[PDB]
DNA sequence: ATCGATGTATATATCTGACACGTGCCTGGAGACTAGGGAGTAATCCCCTTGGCGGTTAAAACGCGGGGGACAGCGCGTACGTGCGTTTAAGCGGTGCTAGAGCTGTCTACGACCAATTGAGCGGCCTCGGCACCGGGATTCTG
DNA sequence: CAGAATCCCGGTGCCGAGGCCGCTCAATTGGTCGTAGACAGCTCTAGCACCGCTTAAACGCACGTACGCGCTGTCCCCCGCGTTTTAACCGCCAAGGGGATTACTCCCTAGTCTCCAGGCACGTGTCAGATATATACATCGAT
């Protein structure tokens, strides 16, 4: 069997934020749990938002609303700009 | 400034239902602030659900869902 | 046949858009998944990951160390008034506690 | 003349309001407050008649429980008068 | 083509097994739903309903009434140690509180 | 247009427990919301149990385990007893 | 059995010191032992329930993580 | 001989244990307690090496948090010594 | 021992609108058959859990001296409760307007399902320098 | 202000983190096609505004008593230090119960079509509960 993980992507981000710093295996296990936690929380609220409106499809509006409901004010304020920029560049490509 | 509409007698009645026998003179201004902070967190969520649906009328279900998300399930309003 | 290019490279992200789209389909959250959902979710997860790692690295530097350890993650989360609100119900193994003593207990 | 001693009417009011179930806050002043708070989020909003009733029921149910908790932490200090620090301690231990 | 008869009549239940089976399939909880799941869930919901109604009806007689109202449901729930644990976070409109005064407050 | 509620079945149960008592519409509304709440709790936990074991189907084993996790010690024993009785009567019909 | 007595007085003092307690009354020890036993019983009942549903005989770390998650407290570092 | 006044060492211990990170309960006694409690639910059970460590981390975090809440309840009564009623009050307000 | 002034509750009659029941009908549950892949059974590998021995110092258990903290009692002075007269505006009953929630119809842009291709990232291996332990010196803070 | 506790610096040395290789199965490109949902138009529910009136409730004042607070005394139970002992921790050796995987095949659930009865709106009417009046009898405070 083969197990997937986010370790390589977390390391790429670390190398972008602090090139000289390293990370221990235990810290990597914590980060790998934090990512799955927030993923399940956002996907859960996006699913509830779809059923309350009788829609059959999840879209970027469901993700944006779930983000505004879950994260605090300043974090939500920045995360919404990051997601909008990413989707705009992807569609323009 | 409508917070003054929550009068001292009403606060005393609420304290009586809670079993309080004697009340200090500074409890009123503390209670007004506590209620003002509580209402805002529910209204912000209700308006968020109203806007997602592109409606202009806030509906009872928006409030029911806003309260349930905070862990305060309310039975009786559907 | 055109040479393949990954969706993450098109969006400019580091996280895997393909894996996120797969997970969204396998979890049964809904019967249809739009093309814009995984790019938005990947961008949000990347933002929060970098936001935490920066504070952890600063804590590691203040302690004069080079490797980040769970103590530094605990110190990073509990010193930020917004991260501590999102992660209030979470306990981190080997994290310890923040130094704090009630003023009434200190000697005159 | 005739006059009751301090505290007998308070106990009679306690026995009164714990038996009844009506709402204790004035409806129209509360409605104006709800209208005033919502204006900071969106303009020209409309409210269904039942939304204000759901909000009023939730607020009164919250305040009664908070006073119930505050009275125990007042008695613990061997006092009978409730004071602000009792509310502050209850809210700190409740985590809100 | 024999004459149709309901699954609830075969199981001996009052609640609708067919509606429950439909609601399970429409919720996307899983891609497949077995035959026995709705009969078991219907029996459980019927049990909890009968227990609540029995206690509320007893509370109605103690007040010489003939019609159940929310006050009787509140008194029925808050006076039972098992139901009160399951419904600890639920708020019932028009229910009110239970009568209780601390012994320290009564007259000397 | 056409709504859907359990008021018929709740009334049928009421006339078996207390054939001399009636119920007000306001109480019926609370009884109607109670069933929807417990239904959603049990179906939720059953779905998680199925996902953890990597199974595609929901069976009576998932319902029984969810009931044993959600209901208190005395309610659980009776609920499980009559759930198994109902299933046995259905399968033997 | 006597195994509850294995939570000695010094261990309780060290825990109280981490929490900032300066002076401790002599009756706190039996109260702390009673408070701890019910917590362990509640978590272990759920863990064994998950173990039995899987038909396993060994109790794994995931059963503990899921039990704590159900009680409303999340543990990071052991899996999930 | 030189002797420190009452309480001087307690503050030093507080600083020491707040700055450290290791576990404080003995491993073997706790492991035997865990295996004893489990025997009431199912016989001949087996445990992984990591399940006991997860349970120990959870129990120590719970107890440290409860002592943090209890110390505020002690100061509210103007005392320094913590007593059982402080624990009972904290647990009652937390709703445990 | 009790009086007597207030308060809560009970018993009888009148009213009204909330509840229980019957009717019409339509859309969603039940009967019958087919196709196919999810779950059940049996067999093998091997890994990690339980059990035991030897031994050495870190940690717990037991005594005792004394001092500083918890508790009860007293005085005092002012904050809150009870009761009255005044005045504010909540509640109700009625009429009228129109904003916008809910629905039907048309149709075209979106996402799901197949097949062929190949390179992204997971498992096994190597190695070297970040960390930790020992010992001695410098600085702080307390009784 | 003597001296006990914490920190830091120079030297030793090892095993955990960083980097390489092989390779296979999960992601991309290209095509078809069915229906989900975006837009336009209409109906008519119920949210908003204004008026007049009665009187329930909020407001402002006086006064006096019961409570909160600060001070003093005393006695006993926590803390700090020393000696003895007991069982935790480390390291090394055995063996076998149970977890994880593969291969086969059968029986369970999904899907389509017909058809018919369960239960949802609508209408009616009669009695359970709400109210006004009279009065019984229980309690609280002073003599």
PDB file of C-alpha atoms in Angstrom, chain F residues 4-80:
ATOM      1  CA  UNK F   4     -44.869  16.921   4.297  1.00  0.00           C
ATOM      2  CA  UNK F   5     -44.932  16.217   8.041  1.00  0.00           C
ATOM      3  CA  UNK F   6     -45.244  13.397  10.599  1.00  0.00           C
ATOM      4  CA  UNK F   7     -48.378  14.751  12.330  1.00  0.00           C
ATOM      5  CA  UNK F   8     -50.442  11.705  11.277  1.00  0.00           C
ATOM      6  CA  UNK F   9     -48.034   9.202  12.821  1.00  0.00           C
ATOM      7  CA  UNK F  10     -47.550  11.267  15.978  1.00  0.00           C
ATOM      8  CA  UNK F  11     -51.328  11.398  16.421  1.00  0.00           C
ATOM      9  CA  UNK F  12     -51.593   7.633  15.856  1.00  0.00           C
ATOM     10  CA  UNK F  13     -49.015   7.051  18.610  1.00  0.00           C
ATOM     11  CA  UNK F  14     -50.729   9.505  20.966  1.00  0.00           C
ATOM     12  CA  UNK F  15     -54.042   7.666  20.661  1.00  0.00           C
ATOM     13  CA  UNK F  16     -52.279   4.420  21.638  1.00  0.00           C
ATOM     14  CA  UNK F  17     -50.513   5.821  24.702  1.00  0.00           C
ATOM     15  CA  UNK F  18     -53.374   8.063  25.925  1.00  0.00           C
ATOM     16  CA  UNK F  19     -56.695   7.580  24.093  1.00  0.00           C
ATOM     17  CA  UNK F  20     -58.341  10.404  26.099  1.00  0.00           C
ATOM     18  CA  UNK F  21     -55.831  13.246  25.519  1.00  0.00           C
ATOM     19  CA  UNK F  22     -55.327  15.655  22.622  1.00  0.00           C
ATOM     20  CA  UNK F  23     -52.437  17.804  21.428  1.00  0.00           C
ATOM     21  CA  UNK F  24     -52.248  21.473  20.408  1.00  0.00           C
ATOM     22  CA  UNK F  25     -50.793  22.609  17.070  1.00  0.00           C
ATOM     23  CA  UNK F  26     -47.920  24.418  18.819  1.00  0.00           C
ATOM     24  CA  UNK F  27     -46.884  21.212  20.587  1.00  0.00           C
ATOM     25  CA  UNK F  28     -47.254  19.257  17.347  1.00  0.00           C
ATOM     26  CA  UNK F  29     -44.742  21.603  15.700  1.00  0.00           C
ATOM     27  CA  UNK F  30     -42.129  20.856  18.369  1.00  0.00           C
ATOM     28  CA  UNK F  31     -42.779  17.127  18.100  1.00  0.00           C
ATOM     29  CA  UNK F  32     -42.359  17.396  14.326  1.00  0.00           C
ATOM     30  CA  UNK F  33     -38.946  19.121  14.607  1.00  0.00           C
ATOM     31  CA  UNK F  34     -37.727  16.594  17.221  1.00  0.00           C
ATOM     32  CA  UNK F  35     -37.948  13.647  14.800  1.00  0.00           C
ATOM     33  CA  UNK F  36     -36.092  15.533  12.061  1.00  0.00           C
ATOM     34  CA  UNK F  37     -33.278  16.312  14.492  1.00  0.00           C
ATOM     35  CA  UNK F  38     -32.699  12.780  15.773  1.00  0.00           C
ATOM     36  CA  UNK F  39     -33.059  11.395  12.227  1.00  0.00           C
ATOM     37  CA  UNK F  40     -30.248  13.658  11.024  1.00  0.00           C
ATOM     38  CA  UNK F  41     -27.976  12.739  13.960  1.00  0.00           C
ATOM     39  CA  UNK F  42     -28.300   8.983  13.434  1.00  0.00           C
ATOM     40  CA  UNK F  43     -27.932   9.117   9.642  1.00  0.00           C
ATOM     41  CA  UNK F  44     -24.834  11.301  10.043  1.00  0.00           C
ATOM     42  CA  UNK F  45     -23.024   8.960  12.395  1.00  0.00           C
ATOM     43  CA  UNK F  46     -23.986   5.920  10.295  1.00  0.00           C
ATOM     44  CA  UNK F  47     -22.383   7.579   7.263  1.00  0.00           C
ATOM     45  CA  UNK F  48     -19.150   8.234   9.153  1.00  0.00           C
ATOM     46  CA  UNK F  49     -18.992   4.621  10.361  1.00  0.00           C
ATOM     47  CA  UNK F  50     -19.399   3.402   6.775  1.00  0.00           C
ATOM     48  CA  UNK F  51     -16.682   5.761   5.488  1.00  0.00           C
ATOM     49  CA  UNK F  52     -14.076   4.771   8.125  1.00  0.00           C
ATOM     50  CA  UNK F  53     -14.376   1.058   7.244  1.00  0.00           C
ATOM     51  CA  UNK F  54     -14.284   1.765   3.473  1.00  0.00           C
ATOM     52  CA  UNK F  55     -17.714   0.327   2.713  1.00  0.00           C
ATOM     53  CA  UNK F  56     -20.130   1.463   0.012  1.00  0.00           C
ATOM     54  CA  UNK F  57     -23.394   0.508   1.761  1.00  0.00           C
ATOM     55  CA  UNK F  58     -25.311   1.361   4.939  1.00  0.00           C
ATOM     56  CA  UNK F  59     -26.766  -1.588   6.863  1.00  0.00           C
ATOM     57  CA  UNK F  60     -28.488  -2.319  10.174  1.00  0.00           C
ATOM     58  CA  UNK F  61     -25.031  -2.773  11.759  1.00  0.00           C
ATOM     59  CA  UNK F  62     -24.282   0.914  11.163  1.00  0.00           C
ATOM     60  CA  UNK F  63     -27.665   1.945  12.592  1.00  0.00           C
ATOM     61  CA  UNK F  64     -27.195  -0.242  15.681  1.00  0.00           C
ATOM     62  CA  UNK F  65     -23.695   1.100  16.353  1.00  0.00           C
ATOM     63  CA  UNK F  66     -24.810   4.707  15.846  1.00  0.00           C
ATOM     64  CA  UNK F  67     -27.678   4.160  18.303  1.00  0.00           C
ATOM     65  CA  UNK F  68     -25.301   2.653  20.880  1.00  0.00           C
ATOM     66  CA  UNK F  69     -22.968   5.651  20.515  1.00  0.00           C
ATOM     67  CA  UNK F  70     -25.655   8.379  20.562  1.00  0.00           C
ATOM     68  CA  UNK F  71     -28.253   7.169  23.099  1.00  0.00           C
ATOM     69  CA  UNK F  72     -27.673   6.890  26.876  1.00  0.00           C
ATOM     70  CA  UNK F  73     -27.268   3.538  28.591  1.00  0.00           C
ATOM     71  CA  UNK F  74     -30.905   2.836  29.458  1.00  0.00           C
ATOM     72  CA  UNK F  75     -32.484   4.240  26.285  1.00  0.00           C
ATOM     73  CA  UNK F  76     -29.982   2.328  24.116  1.00  0.00           C
ATOM     74  CA  UNK F  77     -30.880  -1.122  25.483  1.00  0.00           C
ATOM     75  CA  UNK F  78     -34.607  -0.736  24.798  1.00  0.00           C
ATOM     76  CA  UNK F  79     -34.157   0.958  21.425  1.00  0.00           C
ATOM     77  CA  UNK F  80     -31.817  -1.816  20.247  1.00  0.00           C
TER      78      UNK F  80
END
